[PDB]
Short mmCIF file of C-alpha atoms and ligand atoms in Angstrom, two decimals:
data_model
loop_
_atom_site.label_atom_id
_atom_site.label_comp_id
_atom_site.label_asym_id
_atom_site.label_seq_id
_atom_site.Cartn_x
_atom_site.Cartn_y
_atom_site.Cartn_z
CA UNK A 1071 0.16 -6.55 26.47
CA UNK A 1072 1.62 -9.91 26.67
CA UNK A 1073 4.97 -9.30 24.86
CA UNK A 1074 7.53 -6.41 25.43
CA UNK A 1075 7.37 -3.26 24.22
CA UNK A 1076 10.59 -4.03 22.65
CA UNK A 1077 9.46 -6.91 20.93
CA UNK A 1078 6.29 -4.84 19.77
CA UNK A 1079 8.33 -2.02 18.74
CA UNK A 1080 10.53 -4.75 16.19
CA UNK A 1081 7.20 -6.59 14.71
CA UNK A 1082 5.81 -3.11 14.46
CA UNK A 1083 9.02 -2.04 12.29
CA UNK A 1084 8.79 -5.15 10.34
CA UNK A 1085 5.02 -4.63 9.84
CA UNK A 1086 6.57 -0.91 8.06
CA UNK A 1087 9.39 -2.81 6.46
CA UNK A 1088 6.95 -5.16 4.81
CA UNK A 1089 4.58 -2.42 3.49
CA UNK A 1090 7.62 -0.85 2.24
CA UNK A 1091 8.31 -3.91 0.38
CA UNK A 1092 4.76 -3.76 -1.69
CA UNK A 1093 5.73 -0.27 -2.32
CA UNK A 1094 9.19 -1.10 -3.97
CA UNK A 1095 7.72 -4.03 -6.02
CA UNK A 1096 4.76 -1.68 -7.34
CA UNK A 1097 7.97 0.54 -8.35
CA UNK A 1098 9.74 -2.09 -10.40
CA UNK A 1099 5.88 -2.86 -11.83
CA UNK A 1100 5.88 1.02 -13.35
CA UNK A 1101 9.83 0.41 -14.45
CA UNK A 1102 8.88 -3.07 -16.36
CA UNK A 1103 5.68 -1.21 -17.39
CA UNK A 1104 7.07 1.69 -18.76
CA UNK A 1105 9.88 -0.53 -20.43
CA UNK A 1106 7.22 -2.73 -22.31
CA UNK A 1107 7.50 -5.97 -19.64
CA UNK A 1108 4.04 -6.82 -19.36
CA UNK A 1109 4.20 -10.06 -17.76
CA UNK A 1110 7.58 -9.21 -15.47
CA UNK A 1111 5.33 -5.89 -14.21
CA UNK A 1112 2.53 -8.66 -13.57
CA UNK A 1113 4.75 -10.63 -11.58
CA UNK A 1114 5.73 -7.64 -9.33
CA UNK A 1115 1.99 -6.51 -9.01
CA UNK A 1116 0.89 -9.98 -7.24
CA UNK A 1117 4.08 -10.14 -5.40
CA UNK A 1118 2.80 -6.29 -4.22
CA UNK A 1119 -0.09 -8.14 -3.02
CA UNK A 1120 1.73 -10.66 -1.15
CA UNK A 1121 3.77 -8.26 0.62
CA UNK A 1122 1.03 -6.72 2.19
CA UNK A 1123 -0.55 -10.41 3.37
CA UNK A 1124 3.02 -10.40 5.17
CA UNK A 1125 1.87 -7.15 6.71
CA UNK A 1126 -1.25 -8.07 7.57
CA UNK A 1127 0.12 -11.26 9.21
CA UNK A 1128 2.03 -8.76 11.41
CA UNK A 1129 -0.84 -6.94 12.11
CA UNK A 1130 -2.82 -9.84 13.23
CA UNK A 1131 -0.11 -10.76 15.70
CA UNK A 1132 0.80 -7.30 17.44
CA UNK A 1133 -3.19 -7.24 18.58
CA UNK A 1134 -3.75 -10.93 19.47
CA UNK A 1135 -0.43 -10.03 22.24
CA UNK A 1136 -2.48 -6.66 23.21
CA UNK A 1137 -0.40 -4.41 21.26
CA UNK A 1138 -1.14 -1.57 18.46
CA UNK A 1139 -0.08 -0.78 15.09
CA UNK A 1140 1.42 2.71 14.26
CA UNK A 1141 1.89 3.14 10.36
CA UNK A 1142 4.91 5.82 9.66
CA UNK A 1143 5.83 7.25 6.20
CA UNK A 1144 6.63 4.94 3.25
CA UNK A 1145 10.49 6.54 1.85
CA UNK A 1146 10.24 7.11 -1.85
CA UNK A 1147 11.19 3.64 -3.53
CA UNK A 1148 13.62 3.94 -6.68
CA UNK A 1149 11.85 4.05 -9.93
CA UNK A 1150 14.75 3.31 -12.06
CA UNK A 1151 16.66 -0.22 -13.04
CA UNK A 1152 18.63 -1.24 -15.76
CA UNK A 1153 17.05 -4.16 -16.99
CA UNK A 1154 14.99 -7.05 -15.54
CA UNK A 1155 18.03 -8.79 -14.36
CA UNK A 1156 18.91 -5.45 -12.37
CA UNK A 1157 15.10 -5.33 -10.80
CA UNK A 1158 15.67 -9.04 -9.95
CA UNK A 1159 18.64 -8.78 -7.86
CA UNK A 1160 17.81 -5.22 -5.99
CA UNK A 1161 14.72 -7.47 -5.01
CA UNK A 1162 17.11 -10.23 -3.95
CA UNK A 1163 18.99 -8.18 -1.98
CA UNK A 1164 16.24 -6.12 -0.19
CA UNK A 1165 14.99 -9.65 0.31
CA UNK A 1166 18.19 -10.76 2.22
CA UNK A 1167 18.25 -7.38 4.22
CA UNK A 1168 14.11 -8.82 5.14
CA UNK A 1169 15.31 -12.14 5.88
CA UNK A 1170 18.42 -11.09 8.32
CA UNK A 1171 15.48 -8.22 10.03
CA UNK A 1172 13.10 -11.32 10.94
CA UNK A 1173 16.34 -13.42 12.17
CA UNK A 1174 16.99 -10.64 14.47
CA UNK A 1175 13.75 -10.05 15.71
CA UNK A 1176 14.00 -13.59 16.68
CA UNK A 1177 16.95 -13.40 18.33
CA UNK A 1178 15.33 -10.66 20.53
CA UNK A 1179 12.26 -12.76 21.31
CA UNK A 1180 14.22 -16.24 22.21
CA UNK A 1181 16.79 -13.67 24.62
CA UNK A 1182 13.23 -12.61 26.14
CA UNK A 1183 11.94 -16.27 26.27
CA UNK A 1184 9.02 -15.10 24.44
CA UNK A 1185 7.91 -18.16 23.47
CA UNK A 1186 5.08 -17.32 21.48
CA UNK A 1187 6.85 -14.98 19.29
CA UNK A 1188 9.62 -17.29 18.78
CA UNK A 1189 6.79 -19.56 17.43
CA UNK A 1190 5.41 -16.86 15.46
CA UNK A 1191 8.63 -15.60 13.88
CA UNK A 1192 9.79 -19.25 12.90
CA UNK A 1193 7.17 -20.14 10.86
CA UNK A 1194 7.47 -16.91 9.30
CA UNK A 1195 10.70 -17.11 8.17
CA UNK A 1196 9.54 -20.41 6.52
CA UNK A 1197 7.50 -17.83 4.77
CA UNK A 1198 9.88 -15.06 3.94
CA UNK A 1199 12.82 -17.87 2.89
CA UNK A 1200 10.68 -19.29 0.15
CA UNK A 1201 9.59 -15.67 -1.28
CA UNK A 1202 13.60 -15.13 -1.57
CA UNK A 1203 13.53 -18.12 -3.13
CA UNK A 1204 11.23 -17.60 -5.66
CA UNK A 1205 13.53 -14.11 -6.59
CA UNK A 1206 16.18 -16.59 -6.73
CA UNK A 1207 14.37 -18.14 -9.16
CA UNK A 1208 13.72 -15.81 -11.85
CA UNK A 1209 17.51 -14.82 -11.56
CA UNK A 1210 18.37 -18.62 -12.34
CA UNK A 1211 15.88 -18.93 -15.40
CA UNK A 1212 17.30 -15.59 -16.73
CA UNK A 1213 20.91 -16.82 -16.12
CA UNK A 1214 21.97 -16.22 -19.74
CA UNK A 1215 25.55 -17.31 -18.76
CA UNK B 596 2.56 10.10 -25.03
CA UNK B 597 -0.66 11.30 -26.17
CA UNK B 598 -1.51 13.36 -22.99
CA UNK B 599 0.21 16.50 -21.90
CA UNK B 600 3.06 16.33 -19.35
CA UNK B 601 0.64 18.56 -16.90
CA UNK B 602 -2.07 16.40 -17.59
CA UNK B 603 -0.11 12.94 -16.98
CA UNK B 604 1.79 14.49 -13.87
CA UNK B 605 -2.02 15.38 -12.67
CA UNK B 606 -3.01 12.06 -12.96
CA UNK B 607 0.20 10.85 -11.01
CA UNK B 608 -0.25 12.99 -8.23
CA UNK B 609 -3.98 11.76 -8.22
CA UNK B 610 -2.67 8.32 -8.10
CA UNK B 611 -0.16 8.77 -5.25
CA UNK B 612 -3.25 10.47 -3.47
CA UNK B 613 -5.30 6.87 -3.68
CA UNK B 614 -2.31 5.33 -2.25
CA UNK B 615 -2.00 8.22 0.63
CA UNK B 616 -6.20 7.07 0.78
CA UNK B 617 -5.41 3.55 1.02
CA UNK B 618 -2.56 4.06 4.01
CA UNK B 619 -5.18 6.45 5.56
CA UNK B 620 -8.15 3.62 5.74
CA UNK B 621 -5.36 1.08 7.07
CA UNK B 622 -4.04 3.60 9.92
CA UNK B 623 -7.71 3.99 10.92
CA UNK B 624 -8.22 0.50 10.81
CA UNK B 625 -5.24 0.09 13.21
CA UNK B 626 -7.31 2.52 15.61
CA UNK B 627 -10.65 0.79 15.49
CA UNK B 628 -8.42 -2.53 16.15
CA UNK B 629 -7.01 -1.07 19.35
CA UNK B 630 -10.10 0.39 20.33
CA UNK B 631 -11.68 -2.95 20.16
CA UNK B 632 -13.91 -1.94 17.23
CA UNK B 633 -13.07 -5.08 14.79
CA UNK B 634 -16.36 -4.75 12.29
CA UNK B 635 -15.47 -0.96 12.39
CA UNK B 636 -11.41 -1.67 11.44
CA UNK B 637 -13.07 -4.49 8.73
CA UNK B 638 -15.03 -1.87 7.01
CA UNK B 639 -11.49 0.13 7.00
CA UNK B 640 -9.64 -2.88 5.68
CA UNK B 641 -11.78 -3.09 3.12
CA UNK B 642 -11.83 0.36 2.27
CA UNK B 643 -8.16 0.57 2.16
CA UNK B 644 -8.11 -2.50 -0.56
CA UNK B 645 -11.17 -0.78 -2.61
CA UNK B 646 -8.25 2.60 -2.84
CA UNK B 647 -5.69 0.52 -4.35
CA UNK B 648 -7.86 -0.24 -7.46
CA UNK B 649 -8.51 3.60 -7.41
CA UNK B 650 -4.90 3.59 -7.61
CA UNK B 651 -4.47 0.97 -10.26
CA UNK B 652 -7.14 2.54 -12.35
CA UNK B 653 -4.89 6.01 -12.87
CA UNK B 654 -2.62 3.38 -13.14
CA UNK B 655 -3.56 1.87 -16.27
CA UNK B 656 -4.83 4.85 -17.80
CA UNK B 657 -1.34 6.60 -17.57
CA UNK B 658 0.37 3.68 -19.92
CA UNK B 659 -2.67 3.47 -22.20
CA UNK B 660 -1.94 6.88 -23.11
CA UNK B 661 2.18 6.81 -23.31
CA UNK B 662 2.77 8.34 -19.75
CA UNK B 663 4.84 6.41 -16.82
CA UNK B 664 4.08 6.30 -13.24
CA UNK B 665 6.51 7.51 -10.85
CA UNK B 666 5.83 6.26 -7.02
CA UNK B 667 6.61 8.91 -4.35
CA UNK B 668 7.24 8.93 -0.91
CA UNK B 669 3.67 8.52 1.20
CA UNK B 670 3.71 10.40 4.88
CA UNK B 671 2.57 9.42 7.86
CA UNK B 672 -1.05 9.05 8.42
CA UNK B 673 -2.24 10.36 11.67
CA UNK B 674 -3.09 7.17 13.92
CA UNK B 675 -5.67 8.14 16.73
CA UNK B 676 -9.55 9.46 16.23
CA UNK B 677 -11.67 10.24 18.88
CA UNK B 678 -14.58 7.76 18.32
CA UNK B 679 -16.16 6.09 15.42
CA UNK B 680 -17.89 8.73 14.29
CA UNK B 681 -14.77 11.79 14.81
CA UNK B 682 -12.49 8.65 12.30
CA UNK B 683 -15.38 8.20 9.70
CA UNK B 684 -15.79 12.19 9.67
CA UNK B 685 -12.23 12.77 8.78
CA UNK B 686 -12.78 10.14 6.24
CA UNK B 687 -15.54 12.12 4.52
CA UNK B 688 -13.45 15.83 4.57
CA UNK B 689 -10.16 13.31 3.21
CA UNK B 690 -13.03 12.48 0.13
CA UNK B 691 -14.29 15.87 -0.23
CA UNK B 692 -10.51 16.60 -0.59
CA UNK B 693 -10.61 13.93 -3.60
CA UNK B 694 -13.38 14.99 -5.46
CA UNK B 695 -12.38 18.25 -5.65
CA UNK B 696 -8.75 17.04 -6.96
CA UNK B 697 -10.44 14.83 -9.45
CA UNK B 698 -13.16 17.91 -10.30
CA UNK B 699 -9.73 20.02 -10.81
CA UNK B 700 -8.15 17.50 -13.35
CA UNK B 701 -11.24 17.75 -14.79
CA UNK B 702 -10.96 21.49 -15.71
CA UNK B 703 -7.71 20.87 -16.69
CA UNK B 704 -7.73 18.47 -19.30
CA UNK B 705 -10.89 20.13 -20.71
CA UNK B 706 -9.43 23.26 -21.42
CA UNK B 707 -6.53 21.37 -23.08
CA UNK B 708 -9.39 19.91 -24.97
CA UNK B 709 -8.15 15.96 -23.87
CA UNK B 710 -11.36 14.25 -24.75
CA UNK B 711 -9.79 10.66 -23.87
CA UNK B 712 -8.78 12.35 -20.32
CA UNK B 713 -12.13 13.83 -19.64
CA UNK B 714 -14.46 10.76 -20.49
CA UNK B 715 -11.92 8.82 -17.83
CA UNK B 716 -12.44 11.20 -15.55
CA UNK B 717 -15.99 11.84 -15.89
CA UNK B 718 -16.24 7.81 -15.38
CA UNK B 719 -14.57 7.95 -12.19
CA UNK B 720 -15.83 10.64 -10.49
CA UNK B 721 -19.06 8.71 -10.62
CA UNK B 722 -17.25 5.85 -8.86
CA UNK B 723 -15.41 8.68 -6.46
CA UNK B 724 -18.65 9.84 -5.61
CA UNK B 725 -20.56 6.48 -4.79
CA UNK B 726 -17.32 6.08 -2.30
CA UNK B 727 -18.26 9.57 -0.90
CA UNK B 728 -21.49 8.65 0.15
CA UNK B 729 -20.85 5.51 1.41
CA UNK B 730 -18.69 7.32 3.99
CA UNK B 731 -21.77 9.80 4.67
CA UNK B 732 -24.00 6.14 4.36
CA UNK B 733 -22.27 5.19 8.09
CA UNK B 734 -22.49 8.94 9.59
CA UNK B 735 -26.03 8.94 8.78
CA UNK B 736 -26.46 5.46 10.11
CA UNK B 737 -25.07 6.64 13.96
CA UNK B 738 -26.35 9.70 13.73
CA UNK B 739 -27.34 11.15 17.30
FE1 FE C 1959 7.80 -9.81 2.69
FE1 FE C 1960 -10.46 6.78 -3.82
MG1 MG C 1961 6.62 -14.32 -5.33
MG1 MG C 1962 10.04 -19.88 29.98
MG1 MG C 1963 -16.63 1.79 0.75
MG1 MG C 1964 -12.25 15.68 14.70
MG1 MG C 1965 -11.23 18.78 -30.37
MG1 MG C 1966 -15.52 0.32 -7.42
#
């Protein structure tokens, strides 16, 4: 292995954390579903799927240093908001707890000097800022202020 | 909702059980990876992706009829096989396990007389089954 088993350990945890993610938006897809909010449950069905091409990215990573990936249980997501608004910004700010996760992981790779995860973890929060961004978004357009 | 609450809670467990298959396929696909055994952990990733349109097909039955999903918590997937062959065995007894679930919500909504229910369900057991013996498809393949 050609990173620390502290640094695997984190990307492995992320790897979980972004699973967890697709989980959570699949959740808000039955709550806009079962409220009648066809296109908003749409909209958090492909951003499912992109939360699990951030895990896979992970994935890909952990094996190219020599590590492994361990999968550990998925905690039961809410399945309750109160209104699209309310799904929005629980999404917003699980995304800010994701985006302050990846900043620390980086943190631990530049105090290692791993340079290749450094270089790794940057361009992923390039990534990870945008997909806030897009929650951000939807917030904005609904914005009926 | 024009299924029965036993019959739509059936049908949710059954979809939280394609979801449990899909984590399953992945977690072996982590094992063929560290092993080395990338074509192996391929045929797992895409195994793992053809669950979650299982899962998406109980899915979209349960709102066509009224009902609501409700996602609950997946465990932990065991991570290590011993060999190709000991990982794609425990597939086939984790499908077994499936078909019989399916077979059971079967009997159930055909007692409650849920015709709708029972030609979905007679549909995908046919798809169920093709997945079966795909899984038996590679254990014949290395066999001795
Ligand atoms: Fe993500
Ligand atoms: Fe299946
Ligand atoms: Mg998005
Ligand atoms: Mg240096
Ligand atoms: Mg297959
Ligand atoms: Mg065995
Ligand atoms: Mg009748
Ligand atoms: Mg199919």
């Amino acid at each position: 292995m050609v990173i620390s088993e502290k640094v695997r350990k984190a990307l492995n945890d992320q790897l979980n954390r972004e699973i967890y993610s697709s989980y959570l938006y699949l959740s808000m897809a039955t709550y806009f579903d079962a409220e009648g909010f066809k296109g908003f449950a749409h909209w958090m069905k492909k951003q499912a799927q992109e939360e699990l091409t951030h895990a896979m990215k992970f994935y890909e990573y952990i094996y190219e240093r020599g590590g492994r990936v361990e999968l550990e249980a998925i905690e039961k997501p809410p399945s309750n908001w109160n209104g699209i608004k309310d799904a929005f910004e629980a999404a917003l700010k699980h995304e800010e707890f994701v985006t302050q996760s990846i900043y620390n992981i980086l943190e631990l790779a530049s105090e290692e000097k791993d340079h290749a995860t450094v270089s790794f973890l940057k361009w992923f929060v390039d990534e990870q800022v945008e997909e806030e961004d897009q929650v951000r978004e939807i917030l904005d357009l609904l914005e009926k202020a």
